[model samples]
Target: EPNIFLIFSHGLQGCLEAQGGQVRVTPACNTSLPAQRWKWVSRNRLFNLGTMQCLGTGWPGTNTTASLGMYECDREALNLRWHCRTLGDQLSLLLGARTSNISKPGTGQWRIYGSEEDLCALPYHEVYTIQGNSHGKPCTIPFKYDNQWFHGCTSTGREDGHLWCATTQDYGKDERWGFCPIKSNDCETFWDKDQLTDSCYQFNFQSTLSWREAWASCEQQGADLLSITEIHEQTYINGLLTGYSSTLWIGLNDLDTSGGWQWSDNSPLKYLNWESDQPDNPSEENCGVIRTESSGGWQNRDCSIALPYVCKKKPNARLQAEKRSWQESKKACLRGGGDLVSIHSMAELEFITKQIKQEEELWIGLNDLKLQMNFEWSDGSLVSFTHWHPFEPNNFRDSLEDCVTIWGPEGRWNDSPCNQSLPSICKK
Candidate 1:
């Protein structure tokens, strides 16, 4: 007896099968048959009962066509299955399906199967192509789905079948992506090519010239004086010095005679690389450069001594005092024909605050000599506007300490002993 089966095809197509026979034909309508549904249930496999068709009857061939069939529900279901029989045998299955639905013209539906690692290993789909530089007229990467080009540096990274884009100024210059390393991603290519301009140089001479002559010489060199901003910069410059010992005349001196030591740029000195017990300011060695010893950091020296020294153009601004001191520094300023530096506003106070040297207290012009601890200005006016750092004016455990100094940490004035030899500040 022959095995029999029925093949129902529309449009004058039909088939008849005997026992243990197969029939293949495209059905007239996209409909899920009761027999196909029953077959999917009995075989313990999921059937695509939706609007789809069975392509062919094989392992690899089943994956190539848009067909409906029983698919094994592995970790990620609805994909082809390739089984491994032995320990050494490896099974690799590509579980992506594609359909050409007219909803989206160029793009089609795609889905992945199996573990995330398996899915991620798939090749990236080409969403857009980056073109080469167009005849030296820099080609910019356009924003995805937008008309404008990306504003800053752009980077691309791969994830699964998609590409991710990121923008940053430091991109390409510092970060690594794909095969490109240390690439410039700035809008202006020439901007990245420009080197840090060597705008200033260090000058050394052997002479303890007065601050007056040093100032004159610095002006001649098209630079005013040397000032260092960062400690690292200071260390780097100090490493370059050769054949120089003793005190070199740096472009720092208290010419104001009111003891306001500042650089030519009028910025107060904020950072100090001072050696231990140096800059004694013992009424002699007022101006000096920080000397690095094989032993340790920096030392100060006299300006009048003829030592190989450095001349700076308007060096980084050294800290300048907004106000000098209550009485003595002010008197000294008056004797030298200058008034006590007055802090007119908070901005000036903040500028002065940033330039304070570590661990060193200086005198400002705020004091209460007239009212004995009742805060008064140098102009003999009552202290109307005061920017006291928190919980200040503890009076240093002595109300008798009538003199006030600007405390660095608090950025406010505090009363210290009147005779206490604090560094006095001078402003231009």
Candidate 2:
């Protein structure tokens, strides 16, 4: 029962550890690594499978004012023996010596401390005759990644920082864990520190799930089914799925109203790339997928179809914010200037991007839905200095994304739909 050798804190989400000389009771990941995996040695003796050590209480450190340590397997010990008790719905760990009576564990963000002056405790500071910094480190759980142990951060009822490791773990009977999605960040470097970002654009392929199940799973993890607002985002995702042939679920769906496709973020379907004669069965097919064989084209499929799906965490806006699509957005800009903000060079764009606020996008002029190809400045001159974001000109919805806009921070342009109003910048 290697997998059965699982351990976690009763109230908080940390796992115990018996590493090096003594056991530093701190939060850990629910991994099946050597030290993390536990087993019952002699029916009641709790054993650490990784280090082949047992939990020792009174031997090396002994008595009051000390923490716990790992003991020799041959040593006959009291702390080595332990039994579990489920405090109603919660699990409690107790030593066999004194029926496990030791600490007056309180509710909510529990910490086994040395009382009075000392706040946290370290194993060596308590057991190995080490000196006086009695402030005990909070009890923790063991976690593994890339075959290494990270007796991770102390459980404080909140360990939302996920960029510490790449692959995470969840033992059987454990709740569940993975990368927590972030709203805005370039979180795309080393994949080891499971840094979650909704805006990363890179997609991680997951197991097959029904359309409804996939959507539900994403929401549970603070995200929505993946939506392809830009071709670059979709391309970035597809690049990660090398040799992946299975069609995955996308965030687009018409569940709100038949034939009215919508992204989970509530954005209208301003852009699209449908398969030939696709979404033909709009009434029957409610969910959409990034076509696997066709390479990036979308297709509406049955809702009940169980397939792998992509999930996205949307951006979080700070400061005063208002929502608008571009067609409606022109008026806001028109009050000051007759022409939409025109730019022919990176100099103009660079300056604009720098002057704008950090948390939003703004509209500019350079659209060609009228001719399907000719983009022009207000002067009708060919836009010589053009810098659009990747997948810039994907005229979605049969020409919806015909207007150009820029990310406030980067000044990178994106072809947004006209009716899709947005925060705008007015320049003559």
Candidate 3:
């Protein structure tokens, strides 16, 4: 059923009043409050996040016809089975065994009765939609459990954690949303993009925070502080800050593993643009920064100092340097959220080569791990394209040399022992 994503009621904002186990509506919509966070679950059940109960009807269908309440979230009981729909701008709800769309007449107050199968029933809605990025301020969140994406509404000019992210496995209905707290015509429009290979550095100047606060903030927004791994990327950022002069906090640091400087996004730091002894940690200055032209370029500064900062998206793919056996490498990549990248074409191989260092001898997803010498792509594609480094894959070892590695400047492929650990590239 296409669920009704209601606009937050102005009076109380959709907070249902719960007593004992029964629930009622009284207009106290506090999203931070449990009653306000309604998680629409699979099998068409509305579970309250705070109360841990389902939106149910006790004597509703039998007693007559116009009030709704909550109880134990039982899907087997036909009475608790319900669905909500938006009729034009007004919201209508349905429940009970007969599966009827019963509501009090004239009053917008919805009455639960009978039952519901298709949320879209004798009901029709205009502002309510199947799914899309729309203007009406739509928000979705996974309040846990049945692991579904339950989208909710947020009020204009209010702070809320409601978001519509389609990241779960069978939550389905992957849609983008443009709805916001402020109305469309009121505020200026903006959207984030990744110009580099998933390494985005959005230029936002309105907010300021300490180093740690900035890190957490960017993380919640699904990002990390700008980690400059290359001179060109730093130059790109310098251009991005062409107008602004505020020194920005970036993600490079040795705080966690002191003196072991690393990018938070995990891009291998094979380069640097230090302003000559600029990171001289006089006061244990752990955090790095993108300094204004006036600050003599770059410096590592005390982290707590509040400064405007740049947010950088991590690289889409990372070549693992620490070696893992063939089976272990495959397992590691899956554990890290992707499989060993399948090299579909020579261009992809070259692209990876250009981005990574020549010293990186890593596993490509070409292996006969299943059957010896019966070579196949890691994900089981044919060995149509080959970049053998000379008389490679001569299978010159003890038990086997079936797993492949892209070696050297030529980016040639060479089969090696599966147990031999080498660096690997994981597609993000």
Candidate 4:
């Protein structure tokens, strides 16, 4: 679906527009215009329907300023992926890997910046798109509040809760409003959704356990040990551990190899907040912990040390280890309530890979039996991404290879016969 992109600082009055191969915020918002409509697709990528190009970290003009531009979509490039973050009162689109936030430098001028200013990126639906307001009246489009016109519901003064919209066009004088009907988010009520990563987090305050024990507990709860990815998450964690007296175990470690810290959840290690000269004891201490008594920076600790820890998960899918043919594997998954896993973005691939053994071949839902050179996911998802091995799907040695299997630690896909026995992952 196409969505209207509006700047947070100026409300709907400052809408993003693609004109003459350039993108910038404008003073007016005409929702019906194709130039003002964009679609956020898989991989956190946004494409302007009118331009048929996606947003990237390319310079629009020759002003030598780092800015955003519409360019051909590159799925492999980290700069093309965007992470939606909510920093206090404003929402921002954080560019991938570089962690650059899209900011408004001047009137109608957009620039890429670090995490200092909070520029809002209202992708219309994400903020206030909903059904009729609570008072049996649909919110007035571009409602006026505090002399400013809001195109959708406003969460401005509500802090961390429900969004309210003015029933009239001029609420600054009319003073009529109703709570906007916002869609519920994912994650169970017990889990707290992080504003930065949108991942659910739950702190284990009841008991302390060794690093391995903590990891097992998190796995038992359908999650992995918590991994912090952004500054906002670290700060939020500090608040969660305000009165708690003990250090907490985080999902970072170099147990397999020294000086090679990696998140247990298989996410890329982008943001690091290590203490000065910390992680010093690499010889014996391999587990990572967050020191709550200080600045919430990370430090290495002995894996055997018992400590309270947090769990992180999004409740997406589950994996089971029972070697079976591709057809039998899919049947087993269907019997359990979910279907065989369909590989999507790299993030999802990594998450699924985390559940399988490093050397075991795992069955997925992709197959090309119906039409050679035309692969499709059995789960009926769009074929958005593929992680094929350098030499794969070749029908090696003249064998009829049609089903997909992810093998090896790298999680690369290889086509094999449908009858090849392999463990399979399932997703709801």
Candidate 5:
């Protein structure tokens, strides 16, 4: 079912056609027009049946009125890789290249034409919603329903404007359907949430700044400079800067200790996308940057150079400045519909440590008050990880200490009296 109609042409009444070596919308539906039919090759490239070529745009990532056309297909071309997304009731299909010159990925919409229903389907597509579901069944795109063929989900018959799609290829006979998942609704305007990373991202391209200045800008917005911790993140970022030709500052830097790079957000380094000649100038270059010309690969650049930057914010953790006893801190966090922070990995431990101001001791959720030598998190998670100072949790001289506090620059844990006052970290 790779062959399908491309919609969103002039109020969804037009179908895209391959004509005269170019792609254009034809006003009328013609089942006999082979030019109007296209194959969704590999779920990314649009292969035109008439031209026998894949669809390509004049400008792949940037916002331009460039015409789309048929061209020789290349599997490695990022321009041909279209990312499908649902917009405006899950009916409007936005097809943009995998790379974008803007912060938003779904910048270019292709409104694939389909049935009169609000939500339609493709012949086949990977889930477009943030966490799309098809009732545990693979969705059969372009399924026939109500005497019509829909290329995507539909909200036509729903009273609440919710979109639903048929699971089977034929809906009239099988009658199996499930609601289409919607876009994430929690992030602030212009800040996109990546469900895979559990983080929200935003970028500032209007004003360029040095690495330190960019860091301050992100901090002012309650976020940190971008951190490309995994390949998935780097790929996502590449899509965000598809046609960009300039360098942008990221959170990676060796400012604290030369030749020792670390993420500004405290996430552990597990993945790297370095350019071939990157990190070359060890003494002069201390900040990390990604270049659009090189497919968004990493390069260590001078920290003083001004450049645009991206920011990342993890919305789950919050620092509570109010001082309280161990028991009192837990109570406050619970009232806020969260609990004291629990460290599960070194990355999370570093994140918690960064929240402290001025090397102050902060209360964590670990304690063994219920039974000695058996610690547990306040959030009821497994006690799988622990970070204690040397000779610490000695019950600190065995004076009936049960609560845990993290102190000093290294953020080492120590058992303390339950009555001691300290600020705390809350995780929802």
Candidate 6:
């Protein structure tokens, strides 16, 4: 028997022949070879011949009179063409041996080999790829966990061989990918208590008015324009001022212009003192108080400047208080059926002390009569309580300074003559 040989090509015609026997040729058809018809013959070889190639008699690498080495051919020479209509379509072709007469008579068995196709599918399963420059360089990839597309990739190899898979539809639908970062416990709430307070509790106390009008606004809220009496109080007020980019008006002014700087609460400047060069005067900036600017220290300004002013009410006190001359404010509070504010508690005294520093001189409930330092109340009661500084009432000056008032003892009281027109505290 002779071994028959068949030669096939991917998309072209080919002929087959058996040694010393008739040759046969299959005509090429319009429809190319199916992708599934191809198979691998060896690690790097593939054969898809439908008829066998004999080992001898006109076969290349064959010996005459006896079959020696098996004849082999490259399938590419057959020109077996294949076109895929859709992704993943498999093409197959046959390449094996058949017998013929004229070769050594032997009914040799035909071997079927190389009949598999390469796997094929869509190019990318990713529905969308996101890419952008985040901080320095841009990165593009599908967002994970979108459930829109099924994805597979080998990320570690060289870039050329990296494998990625995304499906047009997973479970019969297109899949989507996103770029959202995973949330964690470290994430903070968007709104906080401070933010809420700032949004809700913020109030505008602005008004275009004289010091009196500004003072009225402060009074309406049970708060006076802010006053600072001590370093701590000044720090606290400054903290509030820090929140604003611009300066806010405060309620310490010397509207009287008589050189007696006082607060709306009518307390004499005692423990709290302003920095030097303050209370700048020429009788123009007569109103006294500190602004957020200039470090919130006492500064004298004009009464009609139309700046904001603060009004003060002693905590839990029935009425708001204003500063007047000691004698006149006494008369006024008496007429109103209320005495000048007499500090009754440590907290009240501390607050008053702080206000004194913030606004400097204010009119408080202390006064003297005759030529002695006899403190008396606006309601005709003698002031028995005293928080005076040590070595006070030493009478630093002459008899004219005898009719005095008490400020926190850290500083000395000026012995202005009785007619000097000191501002007084008027209580409601």
Best by lDDT: 5
Candidate 3 least-lDDT 10 residues = 180-189
User: Taking the tens digit of each residue's C-alpha lDDT, what string does model 6 give over 39-146?
Assistant: 222212222232222121233355433222223332334322222232111211223224442355563111211222222111221111111112111111221223
- Of candidate 2, the 10-residue stretch with the lowest lDDT total is 125-134
The alpha-carbon lDDT assigned to residue 125 of candidate 5 equals 44
Instruction: Give residue 73's error in model 3 in angstroms.
Output: 27
Model 5 lDDT per residue over 150-184, tens place: 55668766697767677675677887665553344
lDDT of 3 by residue, 1-428 (tens): 23332224333234354555555455544435555445465445565666655566555346666445665543345455554564212233332223232444565333221232323433321121112343222133322223332333333222653323322212334443423221121111222444555555544454455777667645644567777655567667767667767777788776765565666776544344656546676347988887766442667888887776666554353767787887778888889778777666679778788786455578888876665444566655544455555334446634567788887776877778878877887765
Q: Report how far off residue 263 is in candidate 5 (Å).
A: 0.4
| Model 1 backbone overlap count | 27
Off by over 4 Å in 3: 1-197, 294-296, 314-428
Off by over 4 Å in 2: 1-198, 201-206, 314-428
Cα-based RMSD of the predictions, in order? Answer: 26.7, 16.2, 18.9, 25.0, 20.2, 32.8
Candidate 1: worst-modelled 10 consecutive residues by lDDT: 83-92
lDDT of 5: 0.66
lDDT of 2 by residue, 1-428 (tens): 31234455445556556566645334655465666655444424455766766655554454554345666544554455544322112222322224343455662233222121111221211000001121111111243333433333222333653422212232222323333223343334312112333463324354556777677655544556777764456556666665777688888877775655567665434356677567767578888888668877788898897676766654432111345666545565565446556776678776676565355666666766555434555435445566655334555556556777776367767777676546766565
Question: Which 10 consecutive positions of candidate 6 have the poorest summed lDDT?
Answer: 130-139
Whole-model lDDT values for every prediction? 0.39, 0.52, 0.54, 0.64, 0.66, 0.37
Candidate 1 local accuracy as lDDT?
0.39
What TM-score would every model get versus the actual structure?
0.30, 0.36, 0.35, 0.31, 0.33, 0.28
| Candidate 5 lDDT score at position 111 | 56
Task: Name the TM-score of candidate 2.
Answer: 0.36
Q: Per-residue error at 97 for model 6, in Å?
A: 99
